[PDB]
Amino acid sequence: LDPQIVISGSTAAFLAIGRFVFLGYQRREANIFATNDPAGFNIIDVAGWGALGHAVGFAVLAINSLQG
Amino acid sequence: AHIVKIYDTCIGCTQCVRACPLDVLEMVPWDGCKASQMASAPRTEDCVGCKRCETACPTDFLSVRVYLGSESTRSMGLSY
Amino acid sequence: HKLFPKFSQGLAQDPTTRRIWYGLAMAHDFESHDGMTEENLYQKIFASHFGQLSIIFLWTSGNLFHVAWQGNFEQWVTDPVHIRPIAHAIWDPHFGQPAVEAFTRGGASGPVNISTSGVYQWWYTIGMRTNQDLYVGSVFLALVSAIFLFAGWLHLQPNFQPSLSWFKDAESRLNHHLSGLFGVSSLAWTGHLVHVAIPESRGQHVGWDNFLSVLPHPQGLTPFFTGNWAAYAQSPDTASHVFGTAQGSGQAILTFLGGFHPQTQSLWLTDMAHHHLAIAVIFIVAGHMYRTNFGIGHRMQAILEAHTPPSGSLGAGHKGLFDTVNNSLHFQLGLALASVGTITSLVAQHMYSLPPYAFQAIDFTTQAALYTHHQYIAGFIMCGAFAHGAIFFIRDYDPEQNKGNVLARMLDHKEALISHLSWVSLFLGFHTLGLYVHNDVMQAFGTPEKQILIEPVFAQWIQAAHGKALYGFDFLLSSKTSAAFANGQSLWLPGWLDAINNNQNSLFLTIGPGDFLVHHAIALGLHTTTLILVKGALDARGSKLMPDKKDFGYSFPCDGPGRGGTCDISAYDAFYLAVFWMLNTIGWVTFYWHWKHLTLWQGNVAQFDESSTYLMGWLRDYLWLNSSQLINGYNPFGMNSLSVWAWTFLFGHLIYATGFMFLISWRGYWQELIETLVWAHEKTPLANLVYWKDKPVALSIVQARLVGLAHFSVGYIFTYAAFLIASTSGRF
Amino acid sequence: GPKRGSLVKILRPESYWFNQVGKVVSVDQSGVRYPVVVRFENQNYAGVTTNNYALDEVVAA
Amino acid sequence: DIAGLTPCSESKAYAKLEKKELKTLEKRLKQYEADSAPAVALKATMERTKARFANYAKAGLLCGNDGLPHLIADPGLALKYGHAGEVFIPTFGFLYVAGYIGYVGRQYLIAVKGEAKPTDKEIIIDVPLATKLAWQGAGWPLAAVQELQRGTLLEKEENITVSPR
Amino acid sequence: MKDFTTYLSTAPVIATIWFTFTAGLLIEINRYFPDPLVF
Amino acid sequence: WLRDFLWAQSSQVIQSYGSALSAYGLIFLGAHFVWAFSLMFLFSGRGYWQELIESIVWAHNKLKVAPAIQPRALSITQGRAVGVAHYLLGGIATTWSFFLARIISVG
Amino acid sequence: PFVPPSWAPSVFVPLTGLVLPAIAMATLFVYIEKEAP
Ligand code: CLA
Ligand code: CLA
Ligand code: CLA
Ligand code: CLA
Ligand code: CLA
Ligand SMILES: CC1=C(/C=C/C(C)=C/C=C/C(C)=C/C=C/C=C(C)/C=C/C=C(C)/C=C/C2=C(C)CCCC2(C)C)C(C)(C)CCC1
Ligand SMILES: CC1=C(/C=C/C(C)=C/C=C/C(C)=C/C=C/C=C(C)/C=C/C=C(C)/C=C/C2=C(C)CCCC2(C)C)C(C)(C)CCC1
Ligand SMILES: CC1=C(C/C=C(\C)CCC[C@H](C)CCC[C@H](C)CCCC(C)C)C(=O)c2ccccc2C1=O
């Protein structure tokens, strides 16, 4: 199998989907300290969305490894 | 010593006073009821907490209340 | 006046013997001490929880030490079917030589006790093989107990006292506990299983010597970081595997097979490994939910303010409940005790039917002891949950900070609650008692064919839904053409089906009309105990007989003989009355459990099926019949090893009976008797030179209820434990 | 306040006859705090059938 | 059949229990005279025993592994397999007579509250009014659902409650 | 005679008569219809 | 006493079913029941029962079936009296059934 | 080197059965009855 492609693609997909379409909703519901990203997408946002990306990627890899 | 309180619903029927087996309560002048009499508890150090006063009171709810507090030799009714 | 107790000067100025008992009974009620503030309250609670931790680890280290020095653990592991586990040796100088001969059972030097606590199966399953491992564990846990005792001393010191803001920080505590204390501990236990406990069952020693040189899997961490996780499930243990050796062994460390190991009749170690790994990942994910000092996370008060439905069916919803859970400790203790009691019932219900440890469920006395132990623990903890809920209503409930939410609306319809609990209790009592008395009259008059035997078709429908092919419903796991049957068939169903269609285990036992009647008696006991406990929680603020009940507190004797008489009117007295029903209900569930398992273990389940539908069959075939070898423990012909359980059986009957004295006879008789005794001592010459320092009085009313319930419960527990252990160990 | 013989309804929540109906006996016209004398057909736990109430504790319903 | 239960007319332990009870009765019978009163009483007992076993095997009851009749309490399963006469028809018969008793008592209470001595009618029963309500209470489910639909079945919140309601 | 029927109208006398009637009705039903378990 | 008297001699009462002594078994169980039933009165107090009756009275008020004679919990002394009476009846009747079944069967 | 010797029950059981209960009950009885200054 291709572990690097699945993990990097899932991480890129979840980081992009949290960077662009779920940023403003997460800011509305919430209402380290400063980055120079223009949307305030700081380190802990990277950590959360990359954690979800690695989790879904390893879930896909495990379900593929069972072949089921 | 126990805690005995008198509330303003008292109608000065004197029933509580004549029910205490220890002479703790007494009637004082007052202007809040037609009888111009109110109970008072100046000697709660001798009160045992038998609650005969609460049984004798006619008002609903009670105008005399006994809250069992810290025990002494007088409040435990000990003759020894 | 006197010093003791140092927390209450109202008790310290008591000239009577009431001072000693009320200093003992009020020592740990810190909220009502002299000069108690809120920070001081939380600090003493934190140190007390350290003290409980140290006592728990010292208890476990003592179990390990007495097994390692006095047990037969290195001899038990070779033949665990025919060798009895030894708890601890007996040094009783009151013995005689027949007792020393009879308690020297085998294989021991002197008199020993045979353990029923089941620690040999648990320790042998998790990898213990020698006594030296148990000595190392005992020394390690004594060291951990000393560390927790020192930490309890340490966090009271003024440079180490936490602030009030540290205790009321709910999000940090749930995040750290759900992540660390649950998930990291379950992950580390998966690490223990994979690294030690699975290779010990394969016949390979893995200790602290060689665990950094023994691979748990022949390809270490390459399937884990490749994502080829199905490689760790390849080649599991064969169905002809001898536990603790390499014959019939496998290579896998994380399977999901279902059912039981064929020899030990217990769960697979790889299944428990992937169990703890899955829930470890789930708890570490769940512990990243709440908002600490990192910007992301949920805010619990915002969650509580959100969940309020339209149309006002819950009123203000969950508004204002964050300042009633976080500010109150009795609310938190009530939630904790409700959860822990239900989980303890869950532990008992899932450990009798799905036994986890190797050669458990062939040691029948261990099964009966563990089930009965955790069921009575769960019953006491549930009564404590409702008791501290009533204490919450009396002390901590602010009605202005709860104007319109769910908790005030419970007090608004409390009469409908208590009335419908009264209705289900009366219904279940009338019809369960009527069916039992009917069947007893049919058995007495010689016609068993007339007796009302209702078939439990709903729980049998559930058993057919789980895969049991005895009742012929054939749906969802019992039919071969089902979607759930076909989807689960490759992976976990072939073990579950083989284990559920066996009638030699406790996994989904065959049920019938006796099981019907007893489950409705159990529902009766639960709904009645819930009626008394809920009625004590809700009428704690006051009733119509006593509207100002919140002004007296939680535990006051009565309000006197006026207004018709008000005896047992406090919420404490409702707890007192509900402990009897808790003991009753757990007695019903343990009589039922024990007798159905005795008829399973003997072979004749037809005896239970024929005799459990009428109460004379209970009294004749479970209590009279299974107490023959118990009461023959000692006799005028000699004694044997069951004489200690016969003495404990009579001991429990005696303590029970002595508690009846405090429950029936009340105070003023005894106070007049003690006044005559005071006269008799002060007038007797040459003994009145000795004089008491504390004035003797009788026990108080609340103290009488507590002492009577205490003797009652201790005699109840000792009587049933003596009967259960003696019957199950003597006849097997 | 209310007149003699009229039916009233009690709003004192710690009373036995709260949310129930009685009959006014007399209303004292002095500066007494609880002038409204109401009899009830059923007795309380103390065997009493008469209580004194204030003006804002009775509603002629 | 249902839950692996055999019918009682097919069950063997049912016939064994029938034979065992007849054997006990004839062992008690064989120590008397022919035309004596204990003999007539025991022969009537044996006749009722045979009639009872024939009636239980006739009604289609389900027996277990011990030969005793088992009852089925599920409306659809019993209506499907012909077991409606053991729980379902008895539960609606009970609800008819229990609601009869409750409705007659409720009408007696509302009839006697409108007098100058309701308690005196509660101690000493008005027998003609009680018999009138007892005969009129046969249409209690119709009158019950009519009092339900008008809002006169319930008292409003003029009930007695505690200070925290 | 009016007072004797008033005494017969009292609660324990009517409870005795009514439970005698109800018990006797059940007894006669269980005599003429011996041992009903179904229907 | 527990084994050779009570346990041993209750054989006759516990196996009296299906014979003419079955009534002694029924009254054995019934007497045990009544004895236990007394403990509810002996161990409790009328305040709890009065409040329970308050809730039930509310339920009856909701359906217009509250009696004109007000439901009251038993008095303290009547609770004690009911307790001791059911206690005595239960125990004595238990020993009655035991004795009679025993001595009629082995006599 | 963990095993306590063979005479250890004959000393430790009467110790915590008689001597430490006696010292404990005596110290607690003196602590209960002590007058406050
Ligand atoms: C989970 C932990 C937990 C904690 C931290 C607490 C804490 C508290 N409880 Mg709660 N409670 C709990 C669980 C807990 N409880 C459980 C499991 C129950 C059910 C039993 C209760 C039921 C309960 C009631 C009814 C009350 C409390 C009260 C209290 C408070 C004071 C306790 C005290 O000072 O009495 C000191 C305790 C004793 C002196 C115990 C006496 C010994 C008992 C009766 C057992 C005797 C059996 C004996 C050991 C057997 C020996 C046999 C022999 C042959 C060897 C304190 C806040 C009281 C309160 O809050 O008042 C307002 C109170 O009234 N609790
Ligand atoms: C075996 C003894 C025993 C029995 C039968 C009961 C029965 C009951 N308890 Mg009690 N209880 C007991 C022991 C017992 N308790 C003890 C030891 C205590 C500790 C003090 C308590 C404390 C207690 C509390 C705190 C509460 C109860 C409640 C109840 C009632 C529960 C509802 C129900 O099941 O109705 C079914 C009815 C029965 C099982 C009773 C039998 C009724 C018979 C069948 C009817 C009459 C038959 C016959 C015609 C009579 C002829 C007699 C002749 C002289 C005329 C029920 C009456 C609760 C309650 O009131 O709920 C509504 C409640 O809150 N009990
Ligand atoms: C007290 C709760 C209760 C429970 C646990 C059951 C249990 C059962 N019902 Mg019964 N039933 C009940 C009360 C109950 N019933 C009541 C009050 C009625 C009158 C409305 C019925 C009327 C009824 C009919 C007409 C039928 C059942 C059937 C069944 C069986 C399968 C139902 C199913 O799979 O759906 C899941 C279970 C539930 C949702 C519980 C409620 C049951 C509802 C009321 C009926 C469900 C019928 C179901 C949709 C039809 C399945 C067809 C079958 C061939 C697969 C199951 C043993 C069926 C049967 O005979 O199977 C052999 C069937 O045909 N029931
Ligand atoms: C007179 C009719 C009558 C009616 C309609 C009701 C109705 C009710 N009762 Mg009440 N009750 C009654 C009399 C009645 N009761 C009597 C006589 C007693 C014993 C003193 C009780 C004691 C009682 C308790 C302890 C409880 C109820 C409860 C209830 C409710 C649930 C149904 C139930 O479980 O009853 C069950 C029936 C009984 C427990 C006893 C009934 C006895 C007989 C059969 C009825 C009386 C017949 C009457 C004398 C006939 C006179 C008519 C004639 C003069 C013309 C329901 C509102 C329960 C509740 O509150 O749930 C919401 C509940 O827990 N009742
Ligand atoms: C904490 C749980 C625990 C329990 C219930 C027991 C129980 C027993 N021990 Mg064991 N013991 C334990 C832990 C325990 N032990 C540990 C961890 C060790 C290693 C240090 C020992 C070392 C030991 C020896 C050498 C012997 C026993 C013996 C015994 C038996 C006789 C009682 C005795 O004299 O012990 C005395 C207890 C000790 C010597 C050690 C306990 C020391 C701890 C620190 C005490 C803790 C204090 C406690 C929490 C509160 C006390 C004060 C309070 C009561 C007011 C009895 C079965 C005797 C025996 O085997 O008879 C056949 C015996 O000879 N024990
Ligand atoms: C700067 C910039 C940029 C770039 C960016 C990037 C490139 C980023 C990345 C980032 C990243 C790349 C991140 C990551 C993250 C990750 C993480 C944070 C992870 C975590 C993990 C986890 C958490 C895991 C876990 C686990 C384990 C350990 C075991 C198994 C199970 C699981 C899977 C669960 C751009 C160009 C756009 C633009 C310009 C600016
Ligand atoms: C008094 C009080 C209190 C207490 C209370 C209590 C004590 C309670 C208890 C409670 C409880 C004790 C509860 C329980 C619960 C449980 C539940 C509710 C469960 C459920 C379950 C489920 C839902 C499941 C299901 C299932 C099945 C069966 C199978 C299939 C699958 C599933 C999983 C789905 C408090 C603290 C609040 C405070 C106030 C006062
Ligand atoms: C259970 C119990 C009660 C409740 C018991 C009560 C209220 C007695 C109920 C007796 C009957 C059931 C009520 C009266 C029935 C009437 C004759 C109504 C007619 C019913 C027809 C079926 C005849 C107490 O009042 C009490 C008081 C003091 C200490 C202990 C206890 C106690 O244990």
Side-chain angles (χ1 to χ4, degrees):
Chain A
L1 277 74
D2 294 331
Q4 297 181 359
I5 296 170
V6 173
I7 295 299
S8 64
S10 179
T11 305
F14 277 94
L15 283 171
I17 211 71
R19 173 62 176 83
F20 292 102
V21 304
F22 290 112
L23 192 144
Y25 177 68
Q26 194 269 330
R27 298 294 178 183
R28 287 190 298 272
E29 293 295 326
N31 193 1
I32 295 171
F33 293 102
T35 59
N36 296 116
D37 194 77
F41 188 72
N42 56 4
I43 303 170
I44 303 168
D45 291 332
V46 174
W49 291 100
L52 293 173
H54 274 81
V56 174
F58 279 103
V60 168
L61 288 174
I63 296 170
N64 206 169
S65 178
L66 186 61
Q67 295 175 355
Chain B
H2 301 305
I3 299 299
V4 181
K5 298 300 182 174
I6 291 301
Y7 296 99
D8 60 4
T9 51
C10 172
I11 63 182
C13 68
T14 323
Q15 293 300 318
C16 69
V17 177
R18 309 214 178 89
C20 174
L22 289 161
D23 184 31
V24 303
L25 309 167
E26 68 186 3
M27 303 300 296
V28 299
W30 191 49
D31 292 330
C33 63
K34 185 64 182 299
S36 67
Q37 287 185 322
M38 191 177 181
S40 68
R43 294 173 296 268
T44 53
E45 65 274 12
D46 299 332
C47 173
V48 295
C50 69
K51 293 172 177 287
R52 290 187 189 183
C53 56
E54 291 184 354
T55 303
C57 184
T59 69
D60 167 82
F61 196 55
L62 296 178
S63 300
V64 51
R65 287 298 264 162
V66 182
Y67 312 92
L68 300 179
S70 296
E71 297 295 329
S72 65
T73 166
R74 292 182 294 263
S75 65
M76 287 284 284
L78 302 181
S79 178
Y80 55 94
Chain C
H1 297 90
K2 295 181 177 66
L3 287 173
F4 181 77
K6 291 177 72 175
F7 53 85
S8 179
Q9 66 180 356
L11 291 176
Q13 294 179 357
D14 193 3
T16 61
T17 61
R18 191 186 68 85
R19 176 182 62 85
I20 302 169
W21 303 109
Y22 276 73
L24 287 169
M26 294 170 63
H28 296 167
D29 193 1
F30 297 108
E31 292 181 354
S32 65
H33 288 174
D34 287 335
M36 182 63 72
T37 61
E38 190 174 4
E39 293 183 354
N40 194 5
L41 177 66
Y42 281 93
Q43 289 169 359
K44 301 301 183 182
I45 290 164
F46 185 63
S48 301
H49 291 177
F50 278 116
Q52 174 73 74
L53 286 171
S54 66
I55 292 173
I56 290 170
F57 284 107
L58 185 60
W59 172 66
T60 309
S61 67
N63 290 322
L64 291 167
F65 182 76
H66 286 286
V67 165
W69 175 46
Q70 290 173 350
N72 54 359
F73 182 75
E74 290 181 352
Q75 297 180 356
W76 183 76
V77 298
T78 59
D79 194 3
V81 182
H82 297 89
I83 294 171
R84 298 295 296 161
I86 291 171
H88 57 87
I90 304 166
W91 192 78
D92 198 357
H94 301 95
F95 277 185
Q97 292 300 111
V100 177
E101 185 179 2
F103 285 95
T104 307
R105 299 183 184 91
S109 66
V112 292
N113 281 315
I114 295 300
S115 70
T116 61
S117 67
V119 293
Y120 289 18
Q121 291 87 17
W122 169 45
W123 293 341
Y124 178 67
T125 306
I126 65 176
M128 299 298 178
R129 295 294 184 270
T130 60
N131 287 320
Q132 187 178 2
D133 295 333
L134 300 173
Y135 290 120
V136 171
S138 66
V139 172
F140 177 71
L141 291 180
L143 188 144
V144 171
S145 179
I147 289 173
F148 279 112
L149 185 62
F150 179 71
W153 181 73
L154 183 63
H155 288 291
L156 290 174
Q157 298 301 108
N159 296 116
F160 295 97
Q161 290 176 356
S163 66
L164 184 60
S165 297
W166 184 77
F167 290 102
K168 289 183 178 180
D169 194 0
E171 285 83 3
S172 179
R173 195 170 73 198
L174 271 180
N175 281 324
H176 281 91
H177 283 173
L178 289 177
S179 65
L181 180 61
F182 288 87
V184 176
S185 295
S186 179
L187 179 62
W189 181 250
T190 310
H192 184 82
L193 288 175
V194 167
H195 283 276
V196 175
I198 295 170
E200 288 292 331
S201 67
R202 303 284 174 82
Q204 186 177 5
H205 181 272
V206 177
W208 292 103
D209 293 331
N210 57 1
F211 77 106
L212 296 173
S213 65
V214 172
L215 296 175
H217 196 273
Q219 46 182 356
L221 268 64
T222 304
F224 184 76
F225 291 108
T226 311
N228 194 2
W229 290 356
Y232 295 114
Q234 293 175 355
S235 178
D237 287 330
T238 314
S240 65
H241 176 263
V242 176
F243 189 83
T245 60
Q247 191 270 330
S249 66
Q251 300 296 322
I253 60 169
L254 299 171
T255 67
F256 184 35
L257 296 173
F260 300 109
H261 188 277
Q263 182 187 5
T264 63
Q265 296 175 357
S266 67
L267 301 178
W268 300 95
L269 285 168
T270 58
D271 296 340
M272 296 185 281
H274 185 51
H275 179 78
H276 283 90
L277 183 58
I279 65 179
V281 174
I282 291 173
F283 283 121
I284 295 169
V285 170
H288 291 89
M289 178 179 173
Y290 300 105
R291 185 176 179 181
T292 58
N293 296 317
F294 291 97
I296 66 166
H298 287 281
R299 178 79 258 174
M300 297 180 189
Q301 186 177 2
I303 300 173
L304 290 168
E305 289 290 329
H307 287 86
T308 170
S311 66
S313 63
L314 299 181
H318 293 84
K319 182 175 181 181
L321 285 175
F322 182 76
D323 291 331
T324 64
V325 182
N326 197 4
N327 291 322
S328 176
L329 288 168
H330 295 287
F331 198 94
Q332 296 173 358
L333 186 62
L335 294 171
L337 287 171
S339 297
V340 169
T342 309
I343 290 307
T344 313
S345 296
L346 192 65
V347 165
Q349 289 301 116
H350 290 177
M351 283 182 68
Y352 81 91
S353 65
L354 294 169
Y357 308 116
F359 294 96
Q360 191 186 0
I362 205 66
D363 192 0
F364 307 119
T365 313
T366 292
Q367 284 285 105
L370 266 303
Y371 183 77
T372 304
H373 181 74
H374 285 95
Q375 286 283 318
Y376 278 100
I377 290 297
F380 278 100
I381 287 175
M382 287 302 294
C383 286
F386 284 95
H388 285 282
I391 299 164
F392 165 72
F393 277 118
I394 294 168
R395 289 183 176 179
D396 293 331
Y397 178 76
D398 195 2
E400 287 86 5
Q401 292 180 357
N402 289 315
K403 187 176 180 180
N405 59 3
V406 291
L407 188 62
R409 292 171 72 92
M410 294 304 284
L411 295 175
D412 288 332
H413 77 288
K414 67 180 182 181
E415 289 88 3
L417 293 166
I418 297 167
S419 297
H420 282 82
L421 279 169
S422 176
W423 181 70
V424 293
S425 297
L426 287 174
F427 176 79
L428 290 171
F430 282 129
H431 291 87
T432 305
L433 184 61
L435 264 65
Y436 277 115
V437 171
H438 181 88
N439 302 329
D440 278 320
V441 172
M442 300 310 108
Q443 293 292 326
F445 288 167
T447 61
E449 73 273 15
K450 297 181 186 181
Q451 70 184 358
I452 298 168
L453 300 180
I454 304 170
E455 186 70 28
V457 74
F458 297 158
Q460 291 169 354
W461 182 71
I462 293 177
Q463 288 182 357
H466 289 169
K468 191 173 181 180
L470 187 63
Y471 302 106
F473 292 100
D474 293 332
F475 76 106
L476 288 176
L477 214 149
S478 298
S479 65
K480 294 181 176 67
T481 62
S482 180
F485 182 82
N487 284 319
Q489 187 61 39
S490 66
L491 62 166
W492 73 78
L493 263 69
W496 181 257
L497 288 169
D498 197 2
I500 202 167
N501 289 317
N502 192 1
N503 295 115
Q504 296 298 108
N505 55 5
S506 297
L507 184 61
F508 288 96
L509 292 170
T510 301
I511 55 174
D515 299 303
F516 179 83
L517 288 168
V518 181
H519 273 88
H520 283 84
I522 291 167
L524 167 62
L526 291 180
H527 282 90
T528 308
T529 312
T530 308
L531 169 64
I532 309 127
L533 285 174
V534 163
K535 189 262 183 185
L538 295 175
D539 289 331
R541 295 290 305 278
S543 62
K544 183 59 66 176
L545 181 59
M546 186 176 177
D548 57 346
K549 192 188 289 183
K550 65 181 180 181
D551 292 332
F552 287 13
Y554 177 71
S555 177
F556 62 97
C558 72
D559 205 2
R563 291 171 290 163
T566 60
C567 302
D568 292 332
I569 196 169
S570 66
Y572 177 77
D573 294 328
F575 172 76
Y576 158 74
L577 294 177
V579 175
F580 295 101
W581 277 90
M582 181 270 295
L583 291 171
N584 188 19
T585 309
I586 307 303
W588 285 347
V589 309
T590 53
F591 285 175
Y592 169 57
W593 192 88
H594 187 200
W595 187 37
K596 191 170 177 67
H597 279 84
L598 282 172
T599 56
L600 183 68
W601 294 337
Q602 290 174 355
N604 50 2
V605 299
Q607 181 178 1
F608 180 75
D609 293 331
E610 288 173 352
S611 295
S612 63
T613 60
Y614 66 104
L615 293 171
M616 194 71 221
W618 287 90
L619 184 64
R620 182 181 64 245
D621 293 330
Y622 173 62
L623 299 175
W624 185 82
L625 181 63
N626 296 114
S627 64
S628 297
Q629 295 178 356
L630 168 60
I631 65 178
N632 281 312
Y634 62 92
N635 53 4
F637 294 101
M639 55 85 68
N640 55 5
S641 66
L642 294 176
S643 66
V644 61
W645 299 106
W647 199 82
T648 310
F649 184 73
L650 287 174
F651 185 71
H653 275 91
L654 181 61
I655 301 171
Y656 180 88
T658 308
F660 279 11
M661 177 168 66
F662 295 98
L663 296 174
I664 294 171
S665 68
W666 290 355
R667 186 184 184 272
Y669 177 79
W670 300 103
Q671 184 61 42
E672 294 175 353
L673 195 66
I674 287 168
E675 285 172 349
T676 61
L677 288 170
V678 164
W679 182 80
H681 184 80
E682 291 184 356
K683 294 295 186 290
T684 300
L686 192 140
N688 56 1
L689 276 72
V690 176
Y691 185 71
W692 55 82
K693 186 64 72 178
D694 290 331
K695 293 184 181 181
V697 294
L699 308 181
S700 63
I701 304 164
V702 174
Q703 178 177 3
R705 287 191 284 261
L706 183 142
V707 168
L709 187 61
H711 283 89
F712 185 86
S713 300
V714 170
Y716 193 88
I717 294 302
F718 283 166
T719 309
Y720 185 66
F723 167 66
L724 175 138
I725 297 299
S727 66
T728 314
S729 68
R731 295 187 183 184
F732 292 100
Chain D
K3 299 298 290 183
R4 296 172 65 91
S6 66
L7 298 176
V8 289
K9 186 176 179 179
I10 304 300
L11 298 178
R12 179 180 291 172
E14 292 190 355
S15 179
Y16 182 79
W17 301 276
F18 174 72
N19 202 357
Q20 291 181 356
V21 176
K23 186 184 286 186
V24 173
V25 175
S26 66
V27 173
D28 194 2
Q29 298 296 321
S30 177
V32 58
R33 295 182 181 181
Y34 301 97
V36 182
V37 183
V38 180
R39 285 176 69 89
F40 297 96
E41 293 178 354
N42 53 0
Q43 66 184 0
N44 55 2
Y45 299 113
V48 183
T49 59
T50 304
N51 195 1
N52 292 322
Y53 294 102
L55 275 306
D56 54 352
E57 294 176 352
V58 292
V59 170
Chain E
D1 197 74
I2 297 168
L5 298 174
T6 183
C8 293
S9 65
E10 189 177 0
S11 180
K12 187 181 287 185
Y14 184 79
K16 182 68 182 294
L17 195 148
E18 196 267 337
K19 184 177 74 175
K20 186 180 289 293
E21 291 184 354
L22 294 180
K23 187 181 289 293
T24 58
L25 289 172
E26 69 184 2
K27 286 182 180 180
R28 187 168 65 185
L29 180 65
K30 65 181 181 180
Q31 58 184 355
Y32 291 101
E33 293 180 354
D35 53 352
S36 65
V40 174
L42 293 179
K43 287 177 184 178
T45 302
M46 293 176 72
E47 183 179 2
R48 289 189 296 273
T49 298
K50 292 181 182 179
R52 180 177 61 244
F53 278 97
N55 287 318
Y56 290 169
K58 181 177 72 175
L61 285 170
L62 293 174
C63 283
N65 297 116
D66 55 356
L68 297 176
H70 295 285
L71 304 180
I72 305 299
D74 189 3
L77 186 66
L79 284 169
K80 182 178 179 181
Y81 289 96
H83 298 286
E86 64 193 6
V87 178
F88 190 78
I89 304 169
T91 186
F92 285 101
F94 183 75
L95 290 177
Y96 184 72
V97 293
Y100 200 105
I101 298 167
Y103 185 76
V104 171
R106 177 249 184 81
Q107 293 298 318
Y108 186 80
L109 256 287
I110 296 176
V112 301
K113 285 181 188 294
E115 295 180 356
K117 50 177 187 294
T119 62
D120 291 330
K121 297 292 183 181
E122 184 170 358
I123 167 174
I124 296 169
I125 308 300
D126 194 1
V127 181
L129 191 144
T131 55
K132 183 176 181 179
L133 292 174
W135 288 112
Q136 288 179 355
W140 76 268
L142 300 174
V145 301
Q146 289 298 321
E147 290 178 354
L148 177 61
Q149 290 175 356
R150 298 283 80 78
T152 62
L153 188 70
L154 292 174
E155 183 68 28
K156 294 181 181 180
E157 287 183 353
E158 295 178 353
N159 293 321
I160 182 65
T161 57
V162 193
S163 57
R165 300 290 295 165
Chain F
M1 188 66 205
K2 184 181 286 185
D3 290 330
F4 181 71
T5 58
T6 308
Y7 172 73
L8 290 176
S9 296
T10 56
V13 179
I14 280 179
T16 299
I17 294 168
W18 184 253
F19 287 157
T20 302
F21 178 75
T22 304
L25 188 144
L26 288 173
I27 284 165
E28 296 287 343
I29 287 172
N30 287 112
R31 174 176 63 188
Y32 289 101
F33 296 97
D35 305 330
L37 187 63
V38 289
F39 295 101
Chain G
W1 285 88
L2 197 135
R3 160 182 68 244
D4 296 337
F5 183 72
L6 294 183
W7 180 86
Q9 301 186 22
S10 64
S11 310
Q12 285 70 38
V13 92
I14 65 186
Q15 300 175 13
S16 63
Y17 275 12
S19 79
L21 305 182
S22 60
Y24 292 119
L26 295 181
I27 297 165
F28 197 59
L29 293 186
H32 270 92
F33 178 82
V34 172
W35 183 84
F37 178 77
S38 71
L39 307 182
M40 175 176 50
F41 295 90
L42 292 175
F43 294 170
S44 64
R46 77 171 304 275
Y48 174 85
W49 299 107
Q50 187 63 48
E51 299 179 330
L52 184 61
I53 286 171
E54 292 181 8
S55 295
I56 304 172
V57 157
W58 176 90
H60 284 69
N61 261 326
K62 186 68 179 177
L63 294 186
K64 300 181 174 182
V65 290
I69 293 172
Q70 293 188 337
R72 288 285 167 271
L74 307 172
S75 68
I76 307 170
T77 52
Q78 184 182 357
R80 298 175 184 163
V82 168
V84 66
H86 289 68
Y87 192 93
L88 292 187
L89 175 63
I92 297 174
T94 303
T95 301
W96 181 75
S97 297
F98 167 52
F99 273 19
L100 295 206
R102 168 64 176 181
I103 198 62
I104 288 177
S105 179
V106 309
Chain H
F2 291 101
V3 178
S6 179
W7 56 267
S10 297
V11 171
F12 282 108
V13 178
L15 194 275
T16 64
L18 297 174
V19 177
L20 292 181
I23 297 168
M25 286 185 281
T27 303
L28 265 299
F29 169 68
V30 174
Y31 179 73
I32 285 167
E33 305 296 331
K34 187 175 180 181
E35 184 73 25

